[PDB]
Tab-separated table of C-alpha atoms in Angstrom:
chain	number	residue	atom	x	y	z
A	1	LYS	CA	107.646	95.091	122.218
A	2	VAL	CA	106.879	94.420	118.774
A	3	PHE	CA	102.834	94.439	117.795
A	4	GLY	CA	101.241	92.209	115.249
A	5	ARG	CA	99.369	94.514	112.706
A	6	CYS	CA	96.177	93.204	113.891
A	7	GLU	CA	97.380	93.088	117.445
A	8	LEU	CA	97.953	96.844	117.306
A	9	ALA	CA	94.620	97.595	115.137
A	10	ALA	CA	92.512	96.154	118.143
A	11	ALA	CA	94.787	98.037	120.798
A	12	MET	CA	94.221	101.171	119.269
A	13	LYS	CA	90.665	100.610	118.841
A	14	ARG	CA	90.290	99.847	122.229
A	15	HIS	CA	91.872	103.295	123.126
A	16	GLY	CA	89.427	105.195	121.018
A	17	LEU	CA	91.417	106.062	117.695
A	18	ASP	CA	88.978	104.445	115.315
A	19	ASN	CA	87.737	107.538	113.644
A	20	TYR	CA	89.212	110.032	116.169
A	21	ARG	CA	88.882	113.660	114.598
A	22	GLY	CA	87.567	111.864	111.465
A	23	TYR	CA	90.905	109.433	111.012
A	24	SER	CA	89.802	106.088	110.508
A	25	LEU	CA	91.597	103.132	112.554
A	26	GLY	CA	93.599	102.359	109.097
A	27	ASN	CA	95.379	105.789	109.259
A	28	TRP	CA	96.576	105.548	112.413
A	29	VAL	CA	97.994	101.899	111.893
A	30	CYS	CA	99.392	103.093	109.041
A	31	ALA	CA	101.323	105.782	110.608
A	32	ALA	CA	102.494	103.322	113.514
A	33	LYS	CA	103.735	101.033	110.455
A	34	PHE	CA	106.081	103.804	108.776
A	35	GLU	CA	106.851	105.557	112.002
A	36	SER	CA	108.368	102.725	114.426
A	37	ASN	CA	107.809	99.502	112.204
A	38	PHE	CA	105.103	98.469	115.338
A	39	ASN	CA	108.068	98.738	117.737
A	40	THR	CA	107.381	100.375	121.223
A	41	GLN	CA	110.943	101.195	121.833
A	42	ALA	CA	111.897	102.823	118.530
A	43	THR	CA	113.678	106.404	118.969
A	44	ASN	CA	115.347	108.599	116.538
A	45	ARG	CA	117.360	111.492	117.031
A	46	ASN	CA	116.762	114.669	115.209
A	47	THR	CA	119.540	117.174	114.179
A	48	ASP	CA	117.961	119.905	116.154
A	49	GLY	CA	118.577	118.138	119.327
A	50	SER	CA	115.201	116.570	119.928
A	51	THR	CA	114.394	112.794	120.052
A	52	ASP	CA	111.198	111.083	118.525
A	53	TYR	CA	110.004	108.446	120.897
A	54	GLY	CA	108.155	105.225	120.597
A	55	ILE	CA	105.138	103.536	118.437
A	56	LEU	CA	104.141	107.065	117.253
A	57	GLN	CA	107.304	108.775	117.111
A	58	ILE	CA	106.468	111.828	119.593
A	59	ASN	CA	108.819	114.511	119.442
A	60	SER	CA	110.582	115.760	122.626
A	61	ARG	CA	110.753	119.498	121.926
A	62	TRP	CA	107.099	120.168	122.624
A	63	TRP	CA	105.490	116.802	123.882
A	64	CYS	CA	107.612	114.761	126.532
A	65	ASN	CA	110.238	115.576	129.018
A	66	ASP	CA	113.602	113.902	128.170
A	67	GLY	CA	115.663	116.407	130.275
A	68	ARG	CA	117.955	116.957	126.903
A	69	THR	CA	116.294	118.945	124.676
A	70	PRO	CA	116.619	122.664	124.631
A	71	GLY	CA	113.745	124.858	124.663
A	72	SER	CA	110.971	122.079	125.596
A	73	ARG	CA	107.749	122.454	126.681
A	74	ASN	CA	106.065	118.804	128.158
A	75	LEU	CA	102.464	119.524	126.917
A	76	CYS	CA	101.517	115.818	127.368
A	77	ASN	CA	103.233	115.952	130.932
A	78	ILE	CA	105.120	112.722	131.072
A	79	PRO	CA	108.364	111.933	130.820
A	80	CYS	CA	109.513	110.683	126.854
A	81	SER	CA	110.640	107.162	128.514
A	82	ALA	CA	106.834	106.513	129.473
A	83	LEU	CA	106.340	106.531	125.547
A	84	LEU	CA	108.769	103.322	125.173
A	85	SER	CA	106.060	101.165	127.167
A	86	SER	CA	104.787	97.954	126.387
A	87	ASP	CA	101.432	99.574	126.769
A	88	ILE	CA	100.302	101.957	124.357
A	89	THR	CA	97.920	104.223	126.687
A	90	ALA	CA	100.586	107.150	127.171
A	91	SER	CA	101.308	107.286	123.307
A	92	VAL	CA	97.917	107.138	122.477
A	93	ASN	CA	96.620	109.934	124.894
A	94	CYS	CA	99.433	112.228	123.646
A	95	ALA	CA	98.519	111.263	120.349
A	96	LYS	CA	95.069	112.609	120.700
A	97	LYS	CA	96.329	115.905	121.711
A	98	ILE	CA	98.853	116.307	118.884
A	99	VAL	CA	96.111	115.253	116.265
A	100	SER	CA	93.921	118.327	117.575
A	101	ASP	CA	96.738	120.752	117.509
A	102	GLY	CA	95.677	122.142	114.253
A	103	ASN	CA	97.470	120.187	111.653
A	104	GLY	CA	95.542	117.090	111.716
A	105	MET	CA	97.670	113.759	110.890
A	106	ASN	CA	100.226	116.071	109.238
A	107	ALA	CA	101.973	116.077	112.450
A	108	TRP	CA	103.330	112.910	111.507
A	109	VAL	CA	105.695	112.747	108.609
A	110	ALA	CA	105.451	109.247	107.747
A	111	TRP	CA	101.893	109.340	107.473
A	112	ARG	CA	101.797	112.567	105.396
A	113	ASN	CA	104.509	110.628	103.062
A	114	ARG	CA	103.088	107.042	103.037
A	115	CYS	CA	99.763	107.071	104.351
A	116	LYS	CA	97.729	110.308	103.316
A	117	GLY	CA	95.423	109.686	100.363
A	118	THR	CA	96.221	106.076	100.128
A	119	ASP	CA	93.655	102.911	100.904
A	120	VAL	CA	94.478	102.914	104.116
A	121	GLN	CA	91.516	100.062	104.938
A	122	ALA	CA	94.063	97.777	103.540
A	123	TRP	CA	96.100	98.239	107.080
A	124	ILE	CA	93.200	96.337	108.934
A	125	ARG	CA	92.833	93.542	106.342
A	126	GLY	CA	92.351	90.162	108.015
A	127	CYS	CA	91.829	91.914	111.764
A	128	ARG	CA	88.891	90.496	113.850
A	129	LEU	CA	87.745	94.029	115.263
């Protein structure tokens, strides 16, 4: 599924991400934009043998089981395939754990490079939330 911008913002707000750990909704929409371009099916294989899955590009070394990543630890207790769903619930629930893991949103490389320190409120422009 490819979400519209405001569509995703409303879904993220429904799932409690607005101001979660002090990160405004715009931060989360910006992260998704540059991690996956709002595509739930996005996947990216890393050189280290892990893969990043779904709308928030969650990594298979630590967070989900894809059964092909050496030394993996499945800390969200889900198959990585669950992160490729149309429903963002599993991704959001796992993202709440990640953002609490001692690095804030710096866990998402694209957020750090393209969102951090910017006017992220622009990402919810036009949205009726």
